[PDB]
Amino acid sequence: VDVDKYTRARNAGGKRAQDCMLLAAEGDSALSLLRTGLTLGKSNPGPSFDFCGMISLGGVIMNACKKVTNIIMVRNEQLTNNKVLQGIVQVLGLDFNCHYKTQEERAKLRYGCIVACVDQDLDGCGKILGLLLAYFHLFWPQLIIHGFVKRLLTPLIRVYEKGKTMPVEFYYEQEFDAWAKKQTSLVNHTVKYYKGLAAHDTHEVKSMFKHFDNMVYTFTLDDSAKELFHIYFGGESELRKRELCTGVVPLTETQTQSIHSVRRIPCSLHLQVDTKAYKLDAIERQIPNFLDGMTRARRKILAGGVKCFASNNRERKVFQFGGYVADHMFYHHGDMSLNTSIIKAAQYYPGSSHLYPVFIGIGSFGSRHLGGKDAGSPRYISVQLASEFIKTMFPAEDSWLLPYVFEDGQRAEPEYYVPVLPLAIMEYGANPSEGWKYTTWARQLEDILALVRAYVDKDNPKHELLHYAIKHKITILPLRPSNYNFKGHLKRFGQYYYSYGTYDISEQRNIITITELPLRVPTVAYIESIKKSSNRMTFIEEIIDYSSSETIEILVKLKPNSLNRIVEEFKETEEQDSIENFLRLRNCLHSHLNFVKPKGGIIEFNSYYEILYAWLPYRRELYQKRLMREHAVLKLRIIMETAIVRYINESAELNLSHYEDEKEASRILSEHGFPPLNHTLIISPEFASIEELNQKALQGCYTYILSLQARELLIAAKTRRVEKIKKMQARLDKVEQLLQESPFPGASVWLEEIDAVEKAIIKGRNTQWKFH
Amino acid sequence: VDVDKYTRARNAGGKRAQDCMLLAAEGDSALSLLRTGLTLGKSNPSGPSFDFCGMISLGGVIMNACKKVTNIIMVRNEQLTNNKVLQGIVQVLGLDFNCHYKTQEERAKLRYGCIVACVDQDLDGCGKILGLLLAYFHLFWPQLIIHGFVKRLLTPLIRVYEKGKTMPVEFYYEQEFDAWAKKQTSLVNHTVKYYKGLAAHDTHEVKSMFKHFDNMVYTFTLDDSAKELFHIYFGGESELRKRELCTGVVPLTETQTQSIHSVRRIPCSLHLQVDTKAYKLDAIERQIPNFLDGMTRARRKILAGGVKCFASNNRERKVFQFGGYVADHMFYHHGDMSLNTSIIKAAQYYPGSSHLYPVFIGIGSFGSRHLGGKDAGSPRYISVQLASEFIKTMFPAEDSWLLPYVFEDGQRAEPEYYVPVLPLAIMEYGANPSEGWKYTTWARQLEDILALVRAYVDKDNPKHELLHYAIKHKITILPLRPSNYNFKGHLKRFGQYYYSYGTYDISEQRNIITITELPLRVPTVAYIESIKKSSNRMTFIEEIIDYSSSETIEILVKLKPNSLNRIVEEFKETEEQDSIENFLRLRNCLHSHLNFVKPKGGIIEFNSYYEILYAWLPYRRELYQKRLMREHAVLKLRIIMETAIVRYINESAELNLSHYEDEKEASRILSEHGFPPLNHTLIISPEFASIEELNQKALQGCYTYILSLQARELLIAAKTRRVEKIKKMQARLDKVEQLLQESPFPGASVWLEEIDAVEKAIIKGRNTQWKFH
DNA sequence: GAGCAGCCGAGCTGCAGCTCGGCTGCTC
DNA sequence: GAGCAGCCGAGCTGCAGCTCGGCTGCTC
DNA sequence: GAGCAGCCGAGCTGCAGCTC
DNA sequence: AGCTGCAGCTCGGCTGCTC
Ligand SMILES: [Mg+2]
Ligand SMILES: [Mg+2]
Ligand SMILES: [Mg+2]
Ligand SMILES: [Mg+2]
Ligand SMILES: [Mg+2]
C-alpha cells in the first residue's frame, strides 16, 4: 500500500501484523519528530520502524457523524472521497461491511492498533482525537472495545527549575495556570509551551521515547459513550447548546488513579474532559465578548498594537506586526491565521466588518466586491494604529485596571476591554462556533450616543426615565440599524429590519441598473448567484459590472419582452416588489446575539438593548475605579515631592558630616522624619491595586533622595517642582470633586470622553479612516 | 477565453481588439491593486478601465524561454510548451508561434493592442521578471517589440515624504535614493517608504498613479545591439555573464534619460544594460557569500538581528517571530517566507549540514542528515536562540562598532561585513548557484586553520618568520585539509580533486552488504532512492533496508544469490574506487567553486583555500589596531571626565550648587573654575564614532556630567569607588599602549587570546551537539 | 539528446477540514 | 411539496506548487 | 486647526546582581 | 566575563498655548 504521507512498518500486513502500531500524527512536522525517535539504536528497545508505522491526519479530520445517513448506513460523497480517511482505511485494511466482533476478523487488519499521536493543545487531543474516536465509534465500535484505538500521552507545558535537571510536566493549560498563580515566584522558572509535537528538543524526544510504552493509553467503551458521541459530534447543535453552557467537570482523584494504573481511558471521560474543554475554548476564540466586541485573537492584536504603536506609530508590515503580537501577547497558534485577523481588522470598505477599524490599513486591503478577500499578501501591506480613535475609545489609564489573561505564567492581553461606547453592538459580525452561531448588525451611531448620554447626563430630559427603564428591562429610545456607507433603504416590518438595494429601469434601452446592493452583500458573489439561477437567466441576456471601487453599478440587460413576464413569474408583496424579487435586492437582518461573558461562558441576549444595558455597569464602574486610583497615587506623589522639596530646602543642613555608605545615609533621613518611599511604585503604579498601593508605597527606602540629581538643587528647578505640587493639589481636589458627582462618580468625564470618541469617528469618517 | 488569473477587457478580441491593453502584473496582490485603479468613476476618462484594459498574472519569475529551445525551424522544449503561465499569455493574446507579425494585418489578428508589464520596481521585478518577458517576445516575435506591442508601466520604488511638503520625492532605483540620502544634511523630518510590490501603494497614491497612467506607460524598441545583449544576459553560455558582471552598470547619460522620457520609449539594449544588469549584480551579492565572514546579505541580517534581539535575554523565540523582528529592525525588503527559511537553515546542525558552527541553537526538530535538512518543522513550531558563547568569541562586540555598515531606507542596518576571529569562509560547507558564478566550498579542518593562523600571529612560534616569507611569494607552507568532523569515512586526493568515501561491510554467509557511512553531505533517503532507480544495480539487489541511527549510518543491502561475483566482474575495480564502492556509488568528488564577494562590492574568483585565508588576514590584523587605538582614545577621555568629577565633589561643598538660579548660569561658574566642557554622552557611549569624529566632538562641552551627579556620589563609599575606577582605567590604559607596541603587529597577544576563546566555545559546542546545555 | 534534480535566495501562489443556520439551488 | 448539498464567515488544525541561476551527477 | 515647545508615559535598552 | 530580571532611561507622542 502506497498512501500519501504514509511510511509503513516493516511487519505491516505480514504474519506479525497484529504486533504493529500505526502512529497517526497531526501533520508532516509531527511525523518528522516521530521518525526522529523511531530511528535510534541507543534506545535499546523504545519502538522502531520494525513494528511502528506513521500516517498523517492532515490537521482536523472530517466529522463522519454529520456526513452519513442510515437506510444500512451510507457515507455521503464528500466522506467517501476524503483522501485522509481513505489512506487510513487502506493502510489498515478496514472493511465497512464488517463489525469486527470476532477475534478472527480483527486479525485480518494490517496493524494491531492505531495510536493517535496528536499535539497536546485542546485542538489536538480534544477535537482531532475526539473526531478520530467518533469515526471508529460510528463504524467499528467493537474495535474500540477490544483496544484497537489507543493514544500516546505527551506533555503540553514543561516548567524547568534553574537548579534541577528534571522538569515538572503538565497536560492541560488549566493544570498549569492554577499551579502558577499559587506559586511564590517564577523568576527561577522558564515556561515552555509545546504548540506541536515537533516542538520538543532532542533531549526531550529521547526521554519521551525511552518511556514510550508507559505513555500509550487505550480507549474503552461504556454505556454513556453512545449518547455523548452524539451530543458532541452529532447533527443536533441543540445538544451542544445544552452541554456547553456549563464548565468541564473534573476527574476525581480515584478516577485519575485507575486511568494511570491500568493505562485505559473510557471514551465517555475523554469526551467530558478533553473534547469538551476544546469546544469551550473554541467558543471563547470565535464568539466575541459583549463588553468590547472582540475575540481573544483580536484583543491580543489590539493590546499588541497599543504596545507596538502608541509610543512610535511608524507603520509596520503585517507579517512583522504579527510576529510582535505573537511574541509579546503569547499567541499559541499558527502565524498565518493571526496575520489574516490582522488584515481583516484593518479593512475599511462599505459593508466591511468594522465601522471603526483599530488600525489604519496602508496598501491594498480589499474591496467590497470580493468581501475583502482581494487584500494584498501580508508581506506587501502595512498597518498603523488608529491612535486618535483608540486613545479616545480605549483610555490608556483604564487598561491598568482591567482583569488580565496570564499565558505561560506571564501577563498577556486584558480579559476584556471596557470601551467608552458599546463596541459590541456598533459593528458587523457573522461567524459560527461550537454550539452557537454569532451574527450582529451594527446599530446607528446617533441612536447609541442618545442612549448612553441619557444614562450619564443628569441634565438629559430622559435620564430618570431611562434608569427606570433599564431596571425593568423595557425600551424607551430607538436602537435602529446603522445606514452609514449604505445608499439603499432600511425598512421595519413587525419585529424585523430589512435591507434593500436600489435599481433603475430604462424601458427604452431595456436595462435594469442596480445602483446599490443589500447590506454586506459582495458584488462578485451577488452577480455569480444570479447566473447560477436558471429561473432568472431565462430573462437576462447579459450582466455587466460597472461598479466603482466602492459604489455599485450593475447593468442587467433584459431579453426582448421580458419585463411583463417578470412581474408575473415574480410576485409583488407589500414588503418587496417584483424587481426586488427578481434581482434578490432584499435581505433580512437576522441576528444571533450570542456573546461571551467576562468570567467565561456563552450568554444569549434577546435585543441590542440588553447588550447595551449589560455593558453600562462595567463602563460606569471603571470610571470610579479609575478616579479612586488617581486619587491614591496623587496623594502618594505629593508626599514624595514635598519630601523632596523639604530635603533640598535643608540640603546643606542634613548633610552635616560625611557618611560612609548608602545604609548610613538612610539612618540620617529616618531620624529626621523623611518617609521611606517606594518611588518605583509611586511613579509607575502599573497594575497595583489600591490596597496594594497603600501597603507597599510607604514601606520603601530613600533612593528618591539619593538618586536626586544636583541640577534639582537649583532655585529655578525648585520653583518648577513646587508649582508641580500646586498642579497635583489642584488636580486632587478636582479628582474628589469628580468622585462626588451625580448620578455616579465620573459622569462628567464620561461625557467628555464620549464627545472625544465622536470627534475621532467624524475625523476618520471624513478621511476614509485614513486620518491623513 | 477561460485562463486562470485572467480578467478580460470588455472589448478584448472584438472589433476594438487593437484598442485594448493587457496588463501583466506579478501576481494576485498586484492584480487586485490594478483592479482597484481600473474601477474608478472619480478618475477617468483620464484613466483607463475594464472597457479596454485586461489583466493577467505572470506568477512571479517567468520561464526563461531561451534555455528551452533547440534549432532543428526552432523547436520549443516540451517543458516550455506546458508552462501554464506562458500558455495562458499566448491564449489570451491569440499569439501564433508560426507567425511573424511583420504587417499591420497580422498584428491585428491578435486579441489585444499591446501588453503592458506592471511589474514591481524592485530589481527582481523590472530587472529579472521584466527582462525575461522581453527575452520571451524577442525570441519568438521580435517584430512585436519593434512595432511597440511590448510596453511597461513605470511605478516608484521609494517615496520620501517631507513633514511640510504635500508632494513626495520619488525614486526608481534603490541606488539613486541611497546616494540622495548621503547628500542630505538630515532626514529626521522625512518618512521613507519602500514599495516591494504594487499592492504596497496606498489608496491616495494609486489614485494619483491613475490620472497619469498614460504619461507613465513606456514602449520598448529594438536596436542592433539588442540581439547580442539578450544572449549575454539570458543565453545558454554563463561565460558571457562572467564577462558582463565584472563591472558595475554604466549609468544612462542625461541625453539618454531625456530622450527616453520625452517620447516614453525605452530601447531593449538600454534596459538590459541598466535594469537587468542591476538585478544580476544584486543577485550575486544576495546568494554569493562574502569571503571575510562567509555570509550572504540575508544571513548577515539574521545574525545582526539575532544579536540585537537576544542580547537582552537569550530566551528562545519561535522562528516566524524572530523572522518578523529581523525583517523590521534590519530592513529586509523581501518575502517573509524566504527569510524564515534562511533562519531555519542557519540553525541546522547535523552530519553534513551546511554549518559546522551555527550562529543559533535550534530548539525542536530542525532536520536530519537523512533528508538533507528538509524534514525540519514549520516555522511556527521550532525556536531559535543565540549561540552566545560562540558568537561573543567569534564576532567580538567591540569590533562591531568599527565595521562599515549598509544603510537601508536612510537608517543603519546590518554591518557591511563581519571580520571574525577565524576565517569563517573556509570553515563551513556551502553549495548554491547565482548569476554567472556557482558557489561550492568544503570545510577545512579546524585544527589546520588554528595552526596556520596562530603561526601568523604568534611571535614566539616556529615558524612565524617562515610563513610571512611565504605569503609575499604566494607560497603555501602548512596544509589546509578538508574537515573530518561528523565523518566516518576517509578522504583521498587524486590529482586536483579530493574524494570522500563511504564505508561498507560484507557478510559472505548472510550475503548482506551493510553501508555504515555515506560520502560527505550525501542525504540517506535520497541515496537509497538513487540505487533503487538503477536497473543496472538492482539486478543484484533483492531488498534494501535502512536501520540507520539518527545520525550514524546503517543500510542493509541484501543481495540476490551469487551476485557478489558478478559485481566485481560487471563493474570495475580501479586503483581509486573498489568495485563495491563503485557498485553502491559510495564516492563523490569535492568539486570547489571558490567564488565570493569582495568588500565594498563585486565578485572575486579564488583558486585555493589558502588565498582566502591570506586575503582575510590583513582585515583582521588591522581591525585589532583600529579597536585598540580607539579604546585608547576613549580611555583618555573617560579619565579626564572622572577626575573632573572627583575634583567637583571634593569642592562640592565649597562651590555649592544650590546657590545659583538657572542651569546655564551654573555652567558659567563651572567654566570659570576650570572644569572642562565635555560631551558626556559621546565619552560614555562612543558607539559608531571614528577617532577623527571622536576627537572633533569630544570637547563640544555641556557640563551635564556634573549636573546629573546624584546625591549618593557625596558618600564616602561612592567617591572611593570612583578612584578605584580611575585606577583600573589608568592601568588598562597602560596595558593598551603595551598591546599597541606589540610584535608582529598591534594586538597580537589579544588575537591569540581570543583564538583560544573561540576554540573553547567550538569545543564546548561539539561536546554538547551544539546545544550548550 | 536532452531532461531531470540539488543547493540558496529570491519572485509569485494554492488546498483539506471544523463550527452554525439562513438561504438557494437542486432533486424527487 | 418536501429531501439534500452547497455556500458563507471567523478562528482554528495541517499542508502544497511553479520559477531563475550554475554546474555536476544520474538515468535515460 | 496646525506649528511650536515642554512634559508626560511606557517601551525597551542599561547596568547591577549574582555569578562561574 | 555574563546572563537577565528589575529599574530606569529615552523620545516620540501628547497637551498646552498662540498665531
Ligand atoms: Mg496543533
Ligand atoms: Mg490560554
Ligand atoms: Mg553643602
Ligand atoms: Mg516583486
Ligand atoms: Mg541597500
Coordinates of C-alpha atoms in Angstrom, one line a residue, chain B residues 573-722:
Chain B
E573 CA 37.9 -2.1 -9.6
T574 CA 40.0 1.0 -10.1
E575 CA 43.1 1.7 -8.0
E576 CA 40.9 4.6 -6.8
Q577 CA 37.4 3.0 -6.5
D578 CA 36.7 -0.6 -5.3
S579 CA 34.0 -2.4 -7.3
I580 CA 31.6 -2.2 -4.4
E581 CA 32.3 1.5 -3.7
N582 CA 31.6 1.8 -7.4
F583 CA 28.6 -0.6 -7.3
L584 CA 26.9 1.3 -4.4
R585 CA 28.2 4.8 -5.5
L586 CA 29.9 5.4 -2.2
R587 CA 32.3 8.0 -3.6
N588 CA 31.8 11.7 -4.5
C589 CA 34.2 14.4 -5.7
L590 CA 34.8 17.5 -3.6
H591 CA 34.4 20.0 -6.5
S592 CA 35.0 23.5 -5.3
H593 CA 33.9 26.9 -6.8
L594 CA 35.7 29.4 -4.6
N595 CA 33.8 32.4 -6.0
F596 CA 33.0 35.0 -3.3
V597 CA 32.0 38.7 -2.9
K598 CA 34.6 41.4 -2.2
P599 CA 34.3 44.1 0.5
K600 CA 32.6 47.3 -0.9
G601 CA 31.2 45.2 -3.7
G602 CA 31.9 42.8 -6.6
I603 CA 32.8 39.2 -7.3
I604 CA 36.2 37.7 -6.9
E605 CA 37.5 34.3 -8.2
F606 CA 39.7 32.5 -5.7
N607 CA 41.7 29.4 -6.8
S608 CA 42.6 27.8 -3.4
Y609 CA 41.6 27.9 0.2
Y610 CA 45.0 29.4 1.2
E611 CA 44.3 32.6 -0.9
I612 CA 41.0 33.2 1.0
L613 CA 42.7 32.9 4.4
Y614 CA 45.6 35.1 3.1
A615 CA 43.1 37.7 2.0
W616 CA 41.2 37.7 5.3
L617 CA 44.3 38.2 7.5
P618 CA 45.0 41.9 6.7
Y619 CA 41.4 42.8 7.6
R620 CA 41.5 41.0 11.0
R621 CA 45.1 42.2 11.7
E622 CA 44.2 45.9 11.0
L623 CA 40.8 45.7 12.9
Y624 CA 42.6 44.8 16.1
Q625 CA 44.6 48.0 15.7
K626 CA 41.5 50.1 14.9
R627 CA 40.0 48.5 18.0
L628 CA 42.8 49.2 20.5
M629 CA 43.6 52.6 19.0
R630 CA 40.0 53.8 19.7
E631 CA 39.9 52.2 23.2
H632 CA 43.0 54.3 23.9
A633 CA 41.2 57.5 22.8
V634 CA 38.1 56.7 24.9
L635 CA 40.1 55.7 28.0
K636 CA 41.9 59.1 27.9
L637 CA 38.7 61.0 27.7
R638 CA 36.9 58.9 30.4
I639 CA 39.8 59.5 32.7
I640 CA 39.6 63.3 32.1
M641 CA 35.8 63.1 32.9
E642 CA 36.1 61.1 36.1
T643 CA 39.0 63.1 37.6
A644 CA 37.0 66.3 36.9
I645 CA 34.0 64.7 38.7
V646 CA 36.3 63.7 41.7
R647 CA 37.5 67.3 41.9
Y648 CA 33.9 68.6 41.8
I649 CA 32.8 66.5 44.8
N650 CA 36.0 67.4 46.6
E651 CA 35.0 71.1 46.0
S652 CA 31.2 70.5 46.0
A653 CA 30.5 72.0 49.5
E654 CA 32.8 74.9 48.5
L655 CA 31.1 75.9 45.3
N656 CA 27.8 74.7 46.5
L657 CA 25.4 74.4 43.5
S658 CA 22.0 75.0 45.2
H659 CA 23.4 78.6 45.3
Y660 CA 22.6 79.6 41.7
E661 CA 19.3 80.1 40.0
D662 CA 19.5 78.7 36.4
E663 CA 21.1 75.8 34.7
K664 CA 23.2 77.8 32.2
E665 CA 24.5 80.1 34.9
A666 CA 25.7 77.1 36.9
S667 CA 27.7 76.1 33.8
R668 CA 29.3 79.6 33.6
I669 CA 30.7 79.3 37.1
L670 CA 31.9 75.7 36.5
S671 CA 33.5 77.0 33.3
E672 CA 35.1 79.9 35.3
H673 CA 36.6 77.4 37.7
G674 CA 38.5 75.4 35.1
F675 CA 36.2 72.4 34.8
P676 CA 36.3 71.1 31.2
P677 CA 33.3 71.3 28.9
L678 CA 32.5 67.7 28.0
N679 CA 30.1 65.9 25.6
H680 CA 29.3 63.2 28.2
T681 CA 27.1 61.0 26.0
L682 CA 29.9 60.6 23.5
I683 CA 32.6 59.6 26.0
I684 CA 30.2 57.3 27.8
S685 CA 28.7 55.9 24.6
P686 CA 31.0 56.4 21.7
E687 CA 29.1 53.7 19.6
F688 CA 30.0 54.1 15.9
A689 CA 32.2 57.2 16.2
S690 CA 35.5 57.3 14.5
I691 CA 38.5 58.7 16.3
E692 CA 38.5 61.7 14.0
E693 CA 34.9 62.3 14.8
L694 CA 35.6 61.5 18.5
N695 CA 38.5 64.0 18.8
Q696 CA 36.5 66.7 17.0
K697 CA 33.3 66.3 19.0
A698 CA 34.6 65.2 22.5
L699 CA 35.2 68.9 23.5
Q700 CA 31.8 70.1 22.4
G701 CA 31.0 70.7 26.1
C702 CA 27.9 70.6 28.2
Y703 CA 28.8 70.2 31.9
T704 CA 25.9 67.8 32.4
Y705 CA 28.4 65.3 33.7
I706 CA 28.4 67.4 36.9
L707 CA 24.8 68.5 37.0
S708 CA 23.5 64.9 36.6
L709 CA 25.5 63.7 39.6
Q710 CA 23.3 62.0 42.2
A711 CA 23.4 62.9 45.9
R712 CA 24.7 59.4 46.6
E713 CA 28.0 60.4 45.0
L714 CA 28.7 62.6 48.0
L715 CA 29.0 59.4 50.1
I716 CA 32.5 58.1 51.1
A717 CA 31.9 54.7 49.6
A718 CA 30.9 56.3 46.3
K719 CA 34.0 58.5 45.9
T720 CA 36.3 55.7 46.8
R721 CA 34.5 53.7 44.1
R722 CA 35.5 56.5 41.7

